Each structure stands twice: as C-alpha cells, then as structure tokens.
Write a protein that binds this ligand. Sequence first.
Ligand SMILES: CC[C@H](C)[C@@H]([C@@H](CC(=O)N1CCC[C@H]1[C@H](OC)[C@@H](C)C(=O)N[C@@H](Cc1ccccc1)c1nccs1)OC)N(C)C(=O)[C@@H](NC(=O)C(C)(C)N)C(C)C
Ligand SMILES: Nc1nc2c(ncn2[C@@H]2O[C@H](COP(=O)(O)OP(=O)(O)OP(=O)(O)O)[C@@H](O)[C@H]2O)c(=O)[nH]1
Ligand SMILES: Nc1nc2c(ncn2[C@@H]2O[C@H](COP(=O)(O)OP(=O)(O)OP(=O)(O)O)[C@@H](O)[C@H]2O)c(=O)[nH]1
Ligand SMILES: COc1cc2c(c(OC)c1OC)-c1ccc(OC)c(=O)cc1[C@@H](NC(C)=O)CC2
Ligand SMILES: Nc1nc2c(ncn2[C@@H]2O[C@H](COP(=O)(O)OP(=O)(O)O)[C@@H](O)[C@H]2O)c(=O)[nH]1
Ligand SMILES: Nc1nc2c(ncn2[C@@H]2O[C@H](COP(=O)(O)OP(=O)(O)O)[C@@H](O)[C@H]2O)c(=O)[nH]1
Ligand SMILES: [Mg+2]
Ligand SMILES: [Mg+2]
Lengths: 430, 428, 429, 430, 123
Amino acid sequence: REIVHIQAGQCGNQIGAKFWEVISDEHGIDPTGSYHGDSDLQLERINVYYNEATGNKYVPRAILVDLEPGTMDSVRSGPFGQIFRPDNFVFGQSGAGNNWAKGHYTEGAELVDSVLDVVRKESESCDCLQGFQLTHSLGGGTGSGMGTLLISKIREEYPDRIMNTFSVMPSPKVSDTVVEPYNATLSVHQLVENTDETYSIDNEALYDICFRTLKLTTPTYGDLNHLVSATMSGVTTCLRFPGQLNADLRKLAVNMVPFPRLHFFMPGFAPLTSRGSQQYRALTVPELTQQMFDSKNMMAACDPRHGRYLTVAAVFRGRMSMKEVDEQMLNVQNKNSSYFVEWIPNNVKTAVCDIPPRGLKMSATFIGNSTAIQELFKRISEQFTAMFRRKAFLHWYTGEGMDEMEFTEAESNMNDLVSEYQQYQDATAD
Amino acid sequence: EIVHIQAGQCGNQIGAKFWEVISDEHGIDPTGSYHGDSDLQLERINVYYNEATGNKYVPRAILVDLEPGTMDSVRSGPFGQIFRPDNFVFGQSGAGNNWAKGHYTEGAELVDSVLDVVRKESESCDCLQGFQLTHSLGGGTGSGMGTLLISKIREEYPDRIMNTFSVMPSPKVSDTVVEPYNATLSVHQLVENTDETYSIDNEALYDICFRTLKLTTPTYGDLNHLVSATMSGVTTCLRFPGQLNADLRKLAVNMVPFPRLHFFMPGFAPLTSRGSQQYRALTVPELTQQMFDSKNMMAACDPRHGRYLTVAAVFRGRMSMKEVDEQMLNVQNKNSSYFVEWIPNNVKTAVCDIPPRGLKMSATFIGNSTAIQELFKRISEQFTAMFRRKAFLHWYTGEGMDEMEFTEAESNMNDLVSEYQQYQDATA
Amino acid sequence: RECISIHVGQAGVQIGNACWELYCLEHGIQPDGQMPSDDSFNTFFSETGAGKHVPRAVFVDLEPTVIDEVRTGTYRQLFHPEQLITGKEDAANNYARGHYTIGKEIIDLVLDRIRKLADQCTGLQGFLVFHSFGGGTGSGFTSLLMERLSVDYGKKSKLEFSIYPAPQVSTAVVEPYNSILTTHTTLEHSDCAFMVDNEAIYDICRRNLDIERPTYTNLNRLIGQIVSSITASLRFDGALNVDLTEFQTNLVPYPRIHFPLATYAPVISAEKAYHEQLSVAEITNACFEPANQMVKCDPRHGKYMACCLLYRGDVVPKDVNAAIATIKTKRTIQFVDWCPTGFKVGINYQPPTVVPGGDLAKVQRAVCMLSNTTAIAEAWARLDHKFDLMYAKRAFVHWYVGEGMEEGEFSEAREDMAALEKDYEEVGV
Amino acid sequence: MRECISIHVGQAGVQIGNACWELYCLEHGIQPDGQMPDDSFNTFFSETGAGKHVPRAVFVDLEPTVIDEVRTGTYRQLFHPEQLITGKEDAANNYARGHYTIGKEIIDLVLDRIRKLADQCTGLQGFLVFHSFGGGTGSGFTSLLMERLSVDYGKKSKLEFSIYPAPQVSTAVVEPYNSILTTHTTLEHSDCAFMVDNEAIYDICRRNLDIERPTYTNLNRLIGQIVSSITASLRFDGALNVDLTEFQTNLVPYPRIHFPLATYAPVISAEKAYHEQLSVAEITNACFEPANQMVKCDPRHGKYMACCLLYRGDVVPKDVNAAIATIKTKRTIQFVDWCPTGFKVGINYQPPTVVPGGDLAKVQRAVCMLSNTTAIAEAWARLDHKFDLMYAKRAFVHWYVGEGMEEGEFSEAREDMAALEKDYEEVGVD
Amino acid sequence: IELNKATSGQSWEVILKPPSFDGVPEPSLEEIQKKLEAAEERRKYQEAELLKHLAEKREHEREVIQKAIEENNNFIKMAKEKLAQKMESNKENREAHLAAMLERLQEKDKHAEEVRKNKELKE
Ligand SMILES: CC[C@H](C)[C@@H]([C@@H](CC(=O)N1CCC[C@H]1[C@H](OC)[C@@H](C)C(=O)N[C@@H](Cc1ccccc1)c1nccs1)OC)N(C)C(=O)[C@@H](NC(=O)C(C)(C)N)C(C)C
Ligand SMILES: Nc1nc2c(ncn2[C@@H]2O[C@H](COP(=O)(O)OP(=O)(O)OP(=O)(O)O)[C@@H](O)[C@H]2O)c(=O)[nH]1
Ligand SMILES: Nc1nc2c(ncn2[C@@H]2O[C@H](COP(=O)(O)OP(=O)(O)OP(=O)(O)O)[C@@H](O)[C@H]2O)c(=O)[nH]1
Ligand SMILES: COc1cc2c(c(OC)c1OC)-c1ccc(OC)c(=O)cc1[C@@H](NC(C)=O)CC2
Ligand SMILES: Nc1nc2c(ncn2[C@@H]2O[C@H](COP(=O)(O)OP(=O)(O)O)[C@@H](O)[C@H]2O)c(=O)[nH]1
Ligand SMILES: Nc1nc2c(ncn2[C@@H]2O[C@H](COP(=O)(O)OP(=O)(O)O)[C@@H](O)[C@H]2O)c(=O)[nH]1
Ligand SMILES: [Mg+2]
Ligand SMILES: [Mg+2]
C-alpha cells in the first residue's frame, strides 16, 4: 500500500523537492496542498505518497534531512516547500563537510535517532506500509554517510519492508571534490547490502546528456535535475497511476532482481527535453522504443551494448497504439537478442499509462538490469584506488575515528561486485 | 411363491418392463386391480402378486438403488403406481459404476435396510420357492450390491432357490472402461451363489436390434423390449396353468447337471420390433429352427461352438402339439453333434394355449450349452487387457480392496471356462 | 378281507382319483358316500353311523395342488380330511429330497392315518401302493413308506402300481435316477409290482381311441380299467385272485422277478358307429398281441413263468376254452423248464363299467391278462442304460448328495439292478 | 444434494469466477440480486427463506483490489460479505509468500468459511479450485488450501481449473517457478485438473473472435463457456445425458495421470453474419484440430487413454454416432493397447447461453472434448525447460529462500515433474 | 381241469404241456432310522460348512470396508504431519534469516561505537 520517502543532504533534498514538484502537479495538487484536478485517477492511488490531512488537504509522506540548514531553508522557501509538514524537516547545523565518516559516524549519528522518531510517526499513519524511498548523493557527507546510516537503521526496524533508493553517482565532469570517490565507494557497499533496489543516477551521464545532446554549454544542477525528475515520475508511474497491474515495490523487486547484490538499475528516458522548454512535436512509437534502448538516452554513463540484460522493464506514457508498442518491443529483443540472457526466459516486461507527463504528449521510461553497470563501479574504483594508493585526503576520515582497513574492505567489496557482474555477463546457457 | 429384487439403472428398468409385460398378461391395470377376461389369469397370480383387499394386487417386488434417479423414473412411470411404497429401498450416494462401492462401502450401508424389507415380504408367503434378481454386471448397484444381496440372502435362506437375470456388458454398448472389472467380480460371485442364471449379453441384444430388427440407432427401450419378451417367456410355466405344473427348483434339478455350470443362453422367436407391426402367422418349423438359430439368442456365443448339456423350450399359443413335437425330434435328429449324448432326452418342450401380447405364437428357449465359455473368455480378455498394466484399478483399491481379489475373480472365472471345456470335449 | 389303497404323489393321486371313480360306478356308490337298493365291495369301503361308505384309501403328496383338486371335486364328500395328507412343497423331482428331506418330516403322520385306517380292520390283507417311478414324491417318499409298512404292518401283502416313465408322456431328465433308486429300495418290500409304461398307454389312446395327443384324464381312464380289472375279484365275489396273497402264488414264483406284464381287450372308442360286439376268441387272441400290452417289451422273445386270464361281463367258459385250444394250434409260445405250460382262467360275471360321457365306450365282454415273462427285463435294460450314461459322467448326482444321500447309493442301486437283470438270465435259459 | 463448493484463489481465480458466475446466473434465470422466477442447479446454489439464491462459492485473495471490484460490483448482492475473503498484502509473485509468510495468516479464516458453506451440504460431491499457475497467491495459497482440505475433508473430490502461463498474456519472469512448485505440492491432493493455456485462449480470441489484443474479460468469458460446459453435467439434469464423475473414471487410469485436455467448439465472432448454424460432425471434427485445444500440445503425435464428448443445445445421438464413426476410421486417433477405443458421450439440452453485450455469438450446438492424451505432457516439458534455465543459475531463488523455503524444495518439485514426464512416457508404451 | 366255482365269479386251471423239470429251484426300524438320521447329519454338515464359508466372506467385507477407513485415517495423518513440519521448518528458517540479518546490523552498530571511541582516543 503506502510509501515513506526520505530525502538526504544537498542533493537528496534538491532532487527530492523536484520529484515532489513533478508528481504533485501530475496528481492535481497545488502548492498549498489542495486538490483541483479533473480526473478521478489522480486520487485513485494518491494514498501511496500523500497523507490525506484535515480540511481535504493532501500532504507528502516525506521526511527532509540534512546536517546543514542551507538547502533545507531553500526548499522551505521553495515553490511548493510550504506543502511538506514542518515537523518532518529533521535538520542539523554541524555540516557533514562532504565527508562520509562525519555523516555515517559522527555529526550524522547525533541526528539519526531524531530522524527515526519522525519515520516511526509516518509509518504509524499507514494502512499497510509497502516500504521506503531514499534520494541522496553518494559523493557528499549527509547524502552518502547519514543516508546509508538511516538505511541501516530503518532496515533494523522494518526488515520486512522494501528499501528502494535514487542514488546519484559522482563525476569529475560535475564536482572537483577530490574525496568524492571515497564517499561513493563506502556508500555503494552500504547500498549493496541494505537496499532492495537502487536506480543508479550518474551525474557523468547527466552532464553529458545536457552537454552533447541538449547543447547546454555550461549545464546547471537545474539542468541535470530536470532529467532526474523526468526519470522519477517515469519509474514511479505504475505505483502512482492505475493500470493493468498491481503495482507493488516487492513484485517489481522479485521480478527485476535475480541475484541479491545485483540490484543497481540503469534508468533511461525518451524524449530528452531541455528544462522548461516547450515540446516541438511528439515522437512516434518506434522513435520511443529505439531511443529508450540507446546508450545516448541512459541515465547512467555505461554502454548497454558492452553487456547483457538480466531483466528490463519499460513504461510507455500517453495515448499511443499498444499493438505498435508490442510490435517494436519484440523487434528490438529479436535483433539485439544477443544483449539479453537466454537463462532468464522472457526478461523484458512492458507497461502502458494513458496519463502522459507534463508537457509531453508521449514518453517512455526504461529500467534495465544490465551487467554493463560494472563500468560505473570500475570508474569509481579506479578513481578510489588512485587516491587510496596515495593515502590521499585520508585524515579527513581517520579524524572521525575511522580505519584505513575500512577503506581496503570497501575497495574489495566494490571489486567483488564487478567480478560478480562479469560472472553473469560471461555466463552461458549450454 | 416368488420374491422379486431389482438393483440399479439396468436392473430396475429391465424389472419394471417384466412387471408391466406380465401385468398385461394377468389383467392387472396400472392401479393394481384385476380387469382380465378369464379366471385362468388369477389361477397362479399368487406367485408374483399379493392381495391388499382391495382386491388390490401388489407385485412381490423390492426396488433397490444406491441413488434415487431410476426409482423416481418408475415412480413417475406408467405402471409405477403398482409397487408398495414401503418397497422402494434407495440411497443418495450412487455407487457410481464401481463394483467396490456397490458391493463394499456404499451398498453395506443400504444392505440391511433392503433385507428387512425382504424379511417382511417373505412372512406373507404360504411356501416360497426362492428369489429372482434382475441386475446388470457392468455398473455398481446391480453389479456389486446385487451380488452382496444374493450372498446375504443365501446366508438368510440357504434352502431357497437363487434365480438371476444378469445383463452382461459389452464394449459396443456403453463406454465405461471399468466394466470388465465389475463383470468379472460379479461373475465370480454368481458361479457360487445362484442356482439358475439367465445370461443376457448386450453385445447380442444390440446386434439383434441393429442387424435383424433393422434398428438404425437402437435405444435401451429396444434392448429391454427383447429382455422383457424373454423374461415373460421363461416364467410362462410358473405363472400360467398348463400340464406343467412345475417350479423354480424342478427347473434347476433338470437344467443344471453340475453346480457351477448353471448359466443359460436365453432365446426368443419371433423377434418383434417395438410397437410395429405384427401381421402374418408363423409356420411351426419357422418358429422352431429360428429359435434354435444363433441370431435369436440373447447371449453372444455361437451354440455351434459347444454342446447343449440340457435345453428348455416353451411354445405359446394355439398350435399342433404333433407338428411342434415333430419339429423338435427333426432338429435333434439333424444337429445331434451339438447335443450331449450322455444325458438322454436332454431337450424338453413345453406349450401354453394363451399366446403373448401382440404375437399370436411365440417360443422361448433356455439352453445350458458349453458355448457360454465364449462369453466368459470375451470378458476375461477385456479384464486382462487393462489388468496386466493395472489400469483403473486405483478406483477399487481406494474402496478398501486388494489386487488379490481381482486375481481370484479372473482365476475363478478362468477355471469356469476350463470347466465348460471338459464336457465340451466329453462323449459316451 | 379289507384293503388300504395308498396313492403317493401327483401320478398315484391322479390315477387313484380315477380308480375310486370307477369302483364307485361299479358298486353304485354316489360321490357323497351313499348307495341305493354281492356285498364284498366293503373290502375297500368303511361305513359311518350315517350310512356312508368311505373309501379305505390314503392320498399323500408333498404339494397341496393335486389333492385340493379332489377336495373340491364332486368326490370331496367321499373321504374324510384326515385321509388326504398334503405338504407345503414337493420333492422337486429329487428321490433324495422325497426320501431323506421332506420324507422324515411327514412319515409318521402318513403312518398314523394308515394306523387309524388299520385300527378299523377284522384283518388286513395288505396294501395297494400307487405312485409314479420318476417323480421325487412318487419315488423318494413311497420307497421310505414301503420300508416302514414292512416294519409296522409286517407280513401283510403289497401290490405296487407304478407308472414307468416315457418321453412322449411328460418325462424329466433325472427320472432314470429316481426310477432305479426307488426299485432298489422298493425291492425287498414289494410282494408283487405291476408296471404301467406310459408309452404303451399313450399309443393305445391313439391307434384305438383316435386321440393324437392324449390328456392325463384319457391315459388314466385306460389305467383305471386295467387296475379295476385286476381288483375285480377282490371287490366282488369271485374265485380267482380272491385275496392279495393269490397274486404272489399265481404269478410270482421267484421273489425278485415280481413284475407281471398286463394285457387288456377290447380297446373301444365311443365316437364311431355301432357294430357287432366282439366274441370271446376275438378278445382272447387280442391278449397276446403286443399292441394291447400294458408295458413295452417283446414277449415273443422271452420265456414265461405264469399266466392268468381275468374275464369281465357276458363271458361263457366253453367259449373261453375253445379260444385256448386255438392258440396252441398255430403258436407254440415258450415257457421256463421249472414251470408248467398253462393258464389260470378266472371269470367275474359283473359287467365292464365305463365312465359315463368318456372316451371309453359301453362293452358287454372284456378280458385283462396277467402274465410273468422274462421279457420284462427288456423294460429294465432301457432304464439301466439311461442311468448309466448320466452316472458315467455324474450328471445331476450333486442334487442327490445335496439332500443327504451318498454317491455310494447310486452304484449300490445300479449294482442290484444288474443282479436283477442276471436273474432273468438265470431263469430265461 | 450432490453439493459443489467453488474456490477462487488470487487475481486469475477470482476474475474467472466472476466470468463463470455471471454466466451461471444466465443459464439458470438468476438475477444479480439472487432472486429467480430442474431443481439440479441447487448443487451450486444455496437458497434462503426469502427466495434469494446464493452460490456455493468462496473468493479468496491476499490483497483487496480484485475482490473489492466484486464488492462494489454489479453482483455485490450475489454473495455474502463473509464468503469474499481478502488480505492486505499480496504474495508479490512468490509461492513461498502465498504458501507460508502471508497466506498462513488467512488460511484458518478461509477454511472456517469453507466449513460454514460445507455445513449446508446434505451430500457434498467435492470442491472446484480456480487459480493461476503464475501468481504468488494462485500458486502458494492454492497448494496450502488443497493440502488443508485433504486433512479437513479427507479423500473428498478436489478439482482444478488452473491457468497455464503465457508470455503474450501478461506473465512474469518467476512464473515457471511458481508453476512447478504448485503442481508438485498439489499433485497428491488433486483428483483431476483442467489446465488452461492462456496462449490458446489468446490464439482463439485472436483467430476466431478476431481480437488483436484480447482483454482478460475476452479471455475469461471464453474460459467460462468451456468451464460451464464441463460443469453443465452437474448444474443440469437431463434424460438426454449430462454425467461428469463417470467421465473422470475413463479420464483417470492412474492417480497421477489426471490432467485432461479440453477442445471446445465452436468459437464464433458475434459479427460472422450468414453463419446460422453448424452440423454435429462439423463441431465433432473441430475437436480434433489443434487450433481448438485449451492447452497447446500435439495429440496427433502422442497416444490416447480416453476421449469424452460433451454435447449441448440441439444434439441427437443419430448424428453423434454418424460423426464418431467417420472419425474412428481415420488413423491419427491412436489409443493405447491397454484401453478401449470408444468415446464416452454426454448430451445436454440447455443451449449454450451467451453473455449480453459479449464477443461470442449465440450457437445452436456447442461441444467440449475431454481426453486423456500423452501429448499434454508437452506443457509440463515446456514449463520445466524455463525452470531449468533459471535454476541452473538459481536466478530469483533468493526470494523464495528468504521467505523460509529450501533449495531442496525446488529439486524435490523438479524431480516430481521429471517423474511425471516419465509417467507419461511409460504409460504411452504398448 | 378245475380250480374253484363262485357267485359273480369262477376259476379253472388249464394245462397244455407239463413241466420238464420236477424240483423247482436251481428288516428293522432302528437300522432304517440309523440310516435316515445318518443322511440328515450329512445334509446338516454340508449346510454348516456352507454357513462357515459365508461367515468368512462376511468377515472379509468387515476387513475391506475397514482398510478403506484405515487408509483414510493414515492419508489425513500424513497430510497433517507433513504440514506440521513444513510449516515449522519454514518458521525456524525465515526467523533465523531475520535473526542473522539483525545480528549483522547490530554487529555493524558495534563498529560505529568504537569509531566514535577512536575519535575520542585521537583527541
Ligand atoms: C450403445 C449404447 C448407447 C448408450 C446407445 C443409446 C442409449 C439410450 O438409448 N438411452 C440412454 C439414456 C436413455 C436411453 C434413451 O434415450 C432417452 C431412451 C429412448 C430409452 O430407452 N430410455 C429409457 C427406457 C425407455 C423405454 C421405452 C420408452 C422410453 C424409455 C431408460 N431410462 C433409463 C435407463 S434406460 O442411445 C441411443 N447409443 C446407440 C448411442 O448412440 C450412444 N453412443 C455410444 O454408446 C457410442 C457412440 C458407441 N460410444 C450415445 C450417443 C447416446
Ligand atoms: N399316467 C400318468 N402319469 C402321470 C400323472 N402325473 C404324473 N405322471 C407321470 O409321473 C412321472 C412324474 O411323477 P409325478 O408324480 O408327477 O411327480 P411327483 O414328484 O411324484 O409329484 P409332484 O412333485 O407333486 O409333481 C412322469 O413320468 C409323469 O408323466 C398322471 O396323472 N397320469
Ligand atoms: N486467464 C486469465 N489469466 C489471468 C488473469 N489474471 C491473471 N492471469 C494470469 O495469472 C498470472 C498472474 O497471476 P495472478 O492471479 O495475477 O496473481 P495472484 O498472486 O494470484 O494474485 P495477486 O497477488 O492479487 O496479483 C499470469 O500468468 C496471468 O497471465 C485473469 O483474469 N484471466
Ligand atoms: C418352471 O418352468 C419349467 C420347469 C421345468 C422345466 C421347464 O421346461 C419345460 C420349465 O419351463 C421353463 C423342465 C426343464 C428341463 C428339462 O430337461 C432339460 C426337463 O426334463 C424337465 C422340465 C420339467 N418337467 C417336464 C416333464 O416338463 C420340470 C421343470
Ligand atoms: N544532479 C545533482 N547532483 C548534485 C546536486 N547537489 C549535489 N550533487 C552532487 O552530489 C555530490 C555532492 O553531494 P552533496 O548532496 O552536495 O553532499 P551532502 O549534502 O553533504 O550529502 C557531487 O558529486 C555533486 O555532483 C543536485 O542538486 N543535483
Ligand atoms: N440392456 C440394458 N442394459 C442397461 C440398461 N441400463 C443400463 N444398462 C447397462 O448397465 C451397465 C451399467 O450398469 P447400470 O445399470 O447402469 O448401473 P448400476 O446402477 O450401478 O447397476 C452397462 O453395461 C449398460 O449398458 C437397460 O435398461 N438395459
Ligand atoms: Mg416331486
Ligand atoms: Mg501475487
């Protein structure tokens, strides 16, 4: 039934607030939290993300978290901002200093218990809690550190529920914060054990998309965030909108996840629009199918053609021909057949929603479990191993009473995931 | 005096016809009252009917079924208003074409209920001869309970005589696979528990309807018409006053030379079609040779493959006793190879001046021929077909049974066939 | 002087129905017991304080049916209810059933009727037993009774009247079993036995009485003539065969060869124009022709041991002796060495009475003929083989063993019938 | 008397039940309230002192949705609220959740309701179970239920109407697992099972009804016509014929060989104009063509151990015989040498009733051919392969194991399946 | 030659040829009853043996209907006992998986403490 959402750190709140903006508009909810939409379907599954408050008002089941007041205040003073319950804003002052160990162990643990106080309170108001949803950067202090601390602390309290995350992968293309690989490596380990499914949102891909495709010379976070928000409404569509399913976070996990550690998903969107740019004319059914499977459209900087798909899920939005949709979908896995495991029969599922996204008459979202993702980790591990080799910026970490051995552990944990990814890539039916 | 038990779909249907056929011959209208012409009809009425003064004539019959269906058919039937309500002994769980259900589990529950009825019906007789059962050997009620009843009756009236109208199944008529299992298990019980057994083969009744009667699509009504015809013809000497003056036990003493060999080949001439059409009289030889020919036998055996141990032959209507006797001795002098020589004057002929309904001259035949082993081999083959692979056997073992009981049934029957092939080969 | 006539089973009862029918006619008794205005007829009738003459007879059968047909008929009044003994169910054509089964049950009750019949005698001559040969009642019961009559009323005579079975006349497949088993049991107890071959009677109702398929009534009308023609001297004031003990003397020399062959003349029908009624020689010569024989055998081939010619009605002795002279003139007719060649003639002057409104017509002259010839063995051999074919393969035996009797008693009976057959060989030399 | 309690498990089960139940109401003049203007239908319908007729049925599901659609439905009044049992959390396509974790919580309450329906049975024949092979409830809960009724009702007759998964008709990656696990656990507890291959139903709509993309409604209504034909012999009583259980005896030679193959004819589009009507032999021949089979298999190549024809509408033996004879000459219908060559025939009086505002047309005469062919074992073999493919790698097995199950259960279930395949090989030997 | 003369009767011997050879030849109730009673026994014994066979056949039925019942109260006993273990093993298993994953999380909660402690040690 219901989903409890946690947004953490600068990026967590930044992406979270836009997700909340996107979906509120989709559901007929205005910034004051009142409803004035035209379709009953908007409210049909509203109970997933919104608490039906007093005076016929709807208010997100969302907890906002940071070890700094900064982003927290911008959100509060944001367009919708007022919409969120102000009791749920669990904020600190200390800062996490783009240091995972400050977040996960020191400054972060001081606020963690206060966070769970609010999370318990939102879990109470549930007829049947489905699970949790976390938005965070794996390169900061709060996002990476305290976000994974919360995972571990929620996981203890709600083992039975689903743990789903939207994790944003660091890139030099975006942030000259040297230690970012360290934070990303430590978080990935925590994720590999504590979440059920993670949508890997690579800032390398995001910059490249805005830059090479969208032709944005100097793309902003606003520009990258728009793609993340596009993607999120996409992935969450079947959960929010009524269709032919039924519509569970668990059912998706059971189908999309063949092996436990391997739950990092490569999202992809089509069409790729520029932030606040009025749409030209709509894409045809094949255009959507083609684009959706293009490396150029992938939310994580990996080539799907350099690997094999264990499982794929595709969501089509708008009032388009499903016979055409199905014709194309098969054609694709009938030529590209060699990019899909023979040992997972019928590994590509397809959903259609007549409710198109704002400003798009027709969109398609892709969710794939590609061994290709090992490229993402390899990149991180490479950058990590470089600094670690040097024992670079390591007193920032050991200064939080941490261990060098914790790093060597994390390093190997990253490597084992690549060895595991490659294992099934290579693996044959015979 | 005679008590009549009818068991199952077949048994009650067969029985209900015999009861409606004889009631016409005896002047008993479907409301149980004498309206006949001559007092010759009432002369031996006490064999089958009781008085409920009345006058009211009630058939000395017990209606037995493990499910209601068939009973209600008779209740709603034409002659139905005739039977004692207190004599419809039925269940609700129908045995469902399982010898095991009928004989063991299900029937056992309804058995004592029926027997108490027969106890009552026997108190009202000055001197009973024995019992008469009409039942099939392919289903559950008539096949299993019918045998079980016979056994419990044997146990209650040892001295009384056991007469049966057993309808032998065929793969042609009916498609219930299990049939040979039911049949063989019933046969095994008949060999030991009855004294006279009229072997009516459905294979034969269908072929008679199909080929001879030109009946393109024969019905049960059609098969049953031929059975009812014979069932009245074989009981002509019991209910009709002639120079015979005989009964069920004298018939047994004279027909059955060896205890186990007691299965008779029924036979009727002419073979009348339902409703249509009568016309034209039969010559004496026409009536005689027709009757001795295989295309007139209710059992599917060629009598030219055996030797007649004993023969009984009732002729009805007005005819020259001379001509009939002349024709019998002519036939015996012609086909002497197929009549046992070591049993003198083993072909007996009876007469009755009152002819049957519609046909003004008929002749019923009862042969105790070694050829009947052909009917058993036919059954034993079908049994062993399924049995070697142990097919459908689960339906029986589920009812508390053992494979041993199937082995025995076939073995006891295979022994019966080997028994017929002793006197089949024997001379004088 | 007195005589008890016992009628056993269906056959004997029906035949005895006819005999008393004829005696009532001859003596002038009404079917009610009364009579109007020689006396010796009493040797068969006992008087009640209400002038009625009750037949000294006891009718037994194991099924009611047959006897009810008497205790319904005009002759119901004749006999008392005690003398007509009936059972619930017959011996089902089984000798073992009649003798061992249904026998034991009824024996004493039947004997008691005979006792109370006997307790009314100045001296009982003997008994006259009527029965079939092939019936389960008219064989099993009779033989059991004959055994008891020999112990209870020992020394007294026995005159058996048995019906020899024939195909043409309602015979059953087990009849030869019953027939010999009875003869083996009824052997040491019978003083004299008269066989009546049903074939012979049947034939005579055809060729002479013009009835193609004769009824029991018709067959019985003929039987009774002979039976009455036998008892002629007992019921009247005759000289030849005055007592039952005369038959043993006059016909039976060897004790076991006690089966005389009878011959009657004339056999006349009513449905035919009148003509000159036959002379003595006419009816005498007729006494040697096999066509008029009571039993089916060749007396032309077989040595004799006795001969008696029993005349009735308008007969004259000179007209009798003249006919005896004529027979020896053309035919020689063989006799056994140890026996004198000659007849014992006896004439009873009472007219031959015929049933009013019957197949048999009015006659002034009649002659029955008793003769013991070795040729009677030819009648036994016919039966002995029928038995031997069935027993050879044990067909039907099960029914007899089932009623108690031993398989030992089948061989025992035949073995004895094989000795009786050799007795006609020892004599017929 | 001769009572028959229906059980509908999961999404597929319930929705097929509704299709069945509306048709049943039509067949017996029953109005959606219960009232109605052959006492034989009582085998399926209980009657109250008010004159309302209630089905002898139970709708179970681990989640509300599907059952709620009945509860607010056009037949909300047709059942008791008591007899429509829903959970709060689905089995998320997991047999181990249906069977253990989740269904354990509902089982007792369900059996308790089945018992209350049972207490109203003067002489209960048995049970009819409608479930999916695929769904976590249709698989796990069903098995749990069958297991418990075998304890509860002992050797009482249990029938199945299972829905064989097809890619074309929804389906999920893990369905082969759920399919194999159920068959195995259910095997002992089932007297006889009617397998329905969703692809066949799909292919029949697509070809005969001309439906480019068939709706569950289009499928389910089709299925209902086949089921009502199988059950006509119980809800109707005719002199003509109609006599199941007797069929069951021919169909089942050995306990484990209890899955007949149904071939229904005719499926006619409610737009085929001139048509009106067909001959007995036309429909009798239709039965022998594969394009009419309920399960996709090849009986032309296998052997037969039984053949049963269930006629309805306007059928006279005269021409049934004629038809049967023409067929028996042709040598493609090869039976085993251990059983006879006759076809067991049953004829109904009540013409096939068609759903107002439906896809099928009104027929003068319909036939359903139940037969025991060795070729059905092809469906097993098909399912098994997909099982083997995934299991070889243990793809998705963690989900089962995590819910309490053991790897052993899969092997046990798989060996059973293999023995069942051998059982069909062995049985077809002459 | 003569015999005797009577009322409505008479008699006389007639000799035609003389006899060649002059010379002529060349029971108890107990034992009938002993024989009758003897056969009655035999009829009564075979009846008794036939009664014995039916009694054994009656017993047979008792045993078969008994097996059918016993076969059910073994099927139900198994199905139930199979269920007992299946439900129990799953219980223990799922709970142990849950108990292990919490120890692991509490184990990592141990690490946290000693890190906060190691920060203090450095200070
Ligand atoms: C080979 C045997 C077979 C089963 C048979 C009869 C059965 C029959 O007549 N049956 C089976 C139900 C009842 C009956 C008939 O249809 C109502 C009526 C007229 C009847 O005789 N009914 C009465 C008796 C009756 C007599 C007189 C008038 C009215 C009724 C009965 N009630 C109950 C039991 S019998 O159908 C024609 N038959 C040739 C068949 O064609 C059958 N087919 C088969 O057996 C094959 C093809 C070989 N598998 C089938 C298609 C019907
Ligand atoms: N002549 C003649 N023979 C008869 C008569 N009744 C029977 N028989 C013959 O006697 C033989 C059979 O004997 P039954 O007396 O009828 O039989 P039963 O056993 O003594 O008597 P039931 O059992 O009561 O019939 C056959 O050869 C018959 O033909 C009759 O009235 N006259
Ligand atoms: N014929 C048909 N197939 C269906 C239907 N619903 C689902 N299916 C099939 O059943 C499978 C999915 O199983 P479900 O019944 O939906 O699942 P469930 O777990 O039992 O129920 P839920 O948990 O409520 O979803 C797939 O193989 C589908 O093709 C239906 O109404 N008709
Ligand atoms: C109750 O009905 C009958 C009873 C019997 C017979 C019979 O067939 C003519 C009947 O008609 C069916 C009978 C049978 C067979 C015989 O030999 C095989 C025999 O010798 C003798 C007979 C019968 N006896 C006579 C002399 O007909 C007695 C038993
Ligand atoms: N796309 C996106 N990435 C962001 C945003 N803010 C920060 N990042 C990325 O997140 C990382 C730093 O994480 P941040 O959220 O600033 O740190 P934290 O607040 O201490 O958890 C870098 O790799 C940045 O590229 C944002 O709003 N959008
Ligand atoms: N001749 C004939 N056979 C019948 C009749 N009814 C059923 N049968 C046969 O009976 C057998 C099955 O037994 P049935 O009487 O139906 O079942 P029961 O109720 O268990 O005795 C099959 O071989 C059928 O052919 C009927 O009226 N006449
Ligand atoms: Mg007798
Ligand atoms: Mg499910």
